[PDB]
Amino acid sequence: MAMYQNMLVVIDPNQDDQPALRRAVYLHQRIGGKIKAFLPIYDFSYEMTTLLSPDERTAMRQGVISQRTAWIREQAKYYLEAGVPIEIKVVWHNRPFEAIIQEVIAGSHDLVLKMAHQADRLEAVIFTPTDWHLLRKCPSPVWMVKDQPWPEGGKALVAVNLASEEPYHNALNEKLVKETLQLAEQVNHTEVHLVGAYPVTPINIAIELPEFDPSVYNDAIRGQHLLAMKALRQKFSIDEKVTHVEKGLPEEVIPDLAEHLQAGIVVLGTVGRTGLSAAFLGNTAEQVIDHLRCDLLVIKPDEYQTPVELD
Amino acid sequence: MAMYQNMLVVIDPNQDDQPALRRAVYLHQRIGGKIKAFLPIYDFSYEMTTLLSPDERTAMRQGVISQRTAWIREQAKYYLEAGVPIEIKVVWHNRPFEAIIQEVIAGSHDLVLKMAHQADRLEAVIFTPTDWHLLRKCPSPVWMVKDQPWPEGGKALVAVNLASEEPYHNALNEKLVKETLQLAEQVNHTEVHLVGAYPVTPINIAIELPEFDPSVYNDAIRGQHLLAMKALRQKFSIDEKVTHVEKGLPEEVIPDLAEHLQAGIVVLGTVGRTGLSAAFLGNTAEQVIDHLRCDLLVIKPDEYQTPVELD
Numbered sequence: 001m002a003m004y005q006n007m008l009v010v011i012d013p014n015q016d017d018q019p020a021l022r023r024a025v026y027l028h029q030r031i032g033g034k035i036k037a038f039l040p041i042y043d044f045s046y047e048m049t050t051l052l053s054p055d056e057r058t059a060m061r062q063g064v065i066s067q068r069t070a071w072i073r074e075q076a077k078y079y080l081e082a083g084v085p086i087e088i089k090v091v092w093h094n095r096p097f098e099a100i101i102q103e104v105i106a107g108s109h110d111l112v113l114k115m116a117h118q119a120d121r122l123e124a125v126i127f128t129p130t131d132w133h134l135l136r137k138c139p140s141p142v143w144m145v146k147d148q149p150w151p152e153g154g155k156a157l158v159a160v161n162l163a164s165e166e167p168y169h170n171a172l173n174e175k176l177v178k179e180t181l182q183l184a185e186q187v188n189h190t191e192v193h194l195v196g197a198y199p200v201t202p203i204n205i206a207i208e209l210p211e212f213d214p215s216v217y218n219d220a221i222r223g224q225h226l227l228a229m230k231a232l233r234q235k236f237s238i239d240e241k242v243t244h245v246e247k248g249l250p251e252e253v254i255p256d257l258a259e260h261l262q263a264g265i266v267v268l269g270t271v272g273r274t275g276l277s278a279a280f281l282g283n284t285a286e287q288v289i290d291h292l293r294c295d296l297l298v299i300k301p302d303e304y305q306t307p308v309e310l311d
Numbered sequence: 312m313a314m315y316q317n318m319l320v321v322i323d324p325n326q327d328d329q330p331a332l333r334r335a336v337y338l339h340q341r342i343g344g345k346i347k348a349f350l351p352i353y354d355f356s357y358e359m360t361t362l363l364s365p366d367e368r369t370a371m372r373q374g375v376i377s378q379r380t381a382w383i384r385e386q387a388k389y390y391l392e393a394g395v396p397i398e399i400k401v402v403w404h405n406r407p408f409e410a411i412i413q414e415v416i417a418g419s420h421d422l423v424l425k426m427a428h429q430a431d432r433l434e435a436v437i438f439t440p441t442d443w444h445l446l447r448k449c450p451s452p453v454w455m456v457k458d459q460p461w462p463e464g465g466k467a468l469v470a471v472n473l474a475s476e477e478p479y480h481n482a483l484n485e486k487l488v489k490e491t492l493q494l495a496e497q498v499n500h501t502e503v504h505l506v507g508a509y510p511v512t513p514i515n516i517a518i519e520l521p522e523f524d525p526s527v528y529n530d531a532i533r534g535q536h537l538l539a540m541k542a543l544r545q546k547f548s549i550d551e552k553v554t555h556v557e558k559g560l561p562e563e564v565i566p567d568l569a570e571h572l573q574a575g576i577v578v579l580g581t582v583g584r585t586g587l588s589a590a591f592l593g594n595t596a597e598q599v600i601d602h603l604r605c606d607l608l609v610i611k612p613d614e615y616q617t618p619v620e621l622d
Contacts, residue, residue, distance in 0.1 A: 063516040094590035279405035
């Protein structure tokens with residue numbers, strides 16, 4: 001099936017330009033999906049309306065909605081005029097991350113896009129607490145669109161966890177790869193790279209195990225991870241030369257490699273509290289995200305159950 | 312009572328230099344408290360120990376603890392030698408923010424200090440998801456120590472919410488002021504400033520109310536907020552000239568004023584989910600924090616109940 005057929009764009013109320021919207025329109029052009037431009041304003045309406053009657057407060061709340069609706073429509077004017085299918089929805093909500101996830105579930109959206117600021121090209125992208133909540137808890141993929149362009153020739157870098165999940169099978173790695181291949185093809189035939197990081201105990205600690213040679217162990221673990229990378233890449237017909245296996249935690253490995261490859265986007269998987277390796281996967285994702293200088297795509301398992309309540 | 316008598320310093324495992332520790336030692340010198348240098352390492356120990364036996368894994372986990380203990384002690388060597396009371400504790404934990412709050416509650420700590428990075432003096436301080444969790448949920452005050460020095464003459468800027476809480480009284484404003492005065496005195500006699508922001512409905516929206524003059528309304532609200540600022544400042548013997556009442560949401564007002572005043576620290580109150588104006592106070596705090604170029608101190612109500620579980 002065509003991917004990203006029902007995109008939810010989170011509008012940034014603090015600036016006219018909307019990178020997330022502009023990205024969604026490009027995706028409409030490439031893959032054909034529809035778009036909901038959604039603005040959940042955190043609810044400061046009561047503080048804004050001190051001394052007013054309840055009827056006046058209602059009127060002011062409604063006027064804000066109508067005006068913001070008009071402002072979005074202005075931003076999207078030529079898109080709309082051209083036939084791009086963009087529905088505009090503005091609400092007040094006590095918790096914007098909750099409103100977005102509830103809108104995802106209610107509207108059956110299959111992608112969320114939201115902008116993130118980058119102040120300097122040598123500095124990490126800035127993520128807000130709303131960004132973090134979404135990334136952690138949204139059931140659909142979340143694409144954080146940095147407010148700076150992709151590098152020409154930019155790569156897509158997929159982080160895969162190659163440690164054995166015996167007796168189970170890692171279905172998430174396959175999803176990340178499959179989904180990234182499909183996306184990358186549509187995005188100017190972007191070249192997809194895979195990276196498996198392998199952490200090991202510091203040499204000067206492991207050297208204390210009796211008769212134990214930490215570099216021999218490390219090479220063992222490297223060998224295993226290379227085997228698993230080879231299995232994964234061959235399942236998807238991916239060349240060896242675009243796969244990367246490196247010693248370290250993911251956060252020690254991925255940022256340097258992303259800078260080396262000029263990644264346009266880094267793709268990461270995380271899982272629910274009940275899933276295998278959930279605490280590790282969440283923390284390492286956070287540590288990697290904290291270093292990223294490019295777009296981020298987080299994808300979760302098919303049957304991920306968000307802990308956000310429905311109404 | 313002497314304040315901050317049992318400080319918990321969160322150690323940053325990724326660098327030798329510890330701004331949070333250095334800050335705690337200064338506070339020991341000024342106010343006399345003891346210090347726990349606490350390092351909760353997110354638990355990647357199982358991924359780090361692929362193919363090892365359970366006994367070997369135990370040994371590696373323990374070796375990490377011992378080595379990190381030694382590394383902290385090295386960082387703190389002259390402090391320790393000089394008689395500064397610094398207890399060192401290193402643990403593995405699945406969720407570092409939880410481990411820190413649990414340590415706060417178990418050890419009866421009355422302050423948490425943690426470093427935050429600032430990449431550029433013209434750019435906001437960077438806050439990690441662990442920082443955010445702590446700020447939201449830690450029952451003790453949290454002092455985020457940016458990794459850059461205070462400006463000479465730096466001010467302490469306290470954000471107070473002056474909207475009437477009729478029929479209740481705002482006890483949190485008083486706590487923030489009282490606590491900031493006590494702290495500021497000890498920190499080189501730092502000059503304390505108060506800021507109340509007053510949001511109002513956009514003129515071009517409120518102008519739609521019949522017979523309604525939005526600038527007359529705005530002035531009304533300004534007058535009220537000035538009255539309330541005057542009451543608060545007089546309770547604490549604070550001069551009018553170090554109080555500031557300005558139209559806008561807090562996040563529209565405070566960052567510019569902090570830059571104008573060269574604030575060394577901005578002090579903010581937030582409350583539990585059950586408290587009055589909880590959603591507004593949380594969101595506006597986040598929006599302000601997202602813009603800060605200086606240290607942050609968040610304080611909560613005396614009977615705040617953290618939603619983090621005890622064991």
